[PDB]
Amino acid sequence: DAEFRHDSGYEVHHQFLVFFAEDVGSNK
């Protein structure tokens, strides 16, 4: 219950998925 009880927003914790995101998408 309450699997967001911290208000983290997000956390990839992997510069591989994000690495893809940054390259493939113009997110940043």
Taking the C-alpha atoms of residue 19 and residue 24, their distance in angstroms, rounded to an integer, is 9
18 a known binding residue?
no
Distance of CA 6 to the CA centre of its chain: 15
Paired tokens of 15 = 């510069």
Paired tokens of 17 = 């998925």
Taking the C-alpha atoms of residue 20 and residue 1, their distance in angstroms, rounded to an integer, is 32
**b/e per residue, 5-18, with b = 16+ CB within 10 A?**
eeeeeeeeeeeeee
Where do we find the tokens 């219950």? 1
Q: Are 12 and 20 in contact (CB under 8 A)?
A: no
Taking the C-alpha atoms of residue 3 and residue 12, their distance in angstroms, rounded to an integer, is 16
11 a known binding residue?
no
DSSP secondary structure letter of residue 19: H
Q: What are phi and psi of 21, to 5 degrees?
A: -50, -50
7 a known binding residue?
no
Identify residue 8 by its one-letter amino acid code: S
**How was this structure obtained?**
NMR
13 a known binding residue?
yes
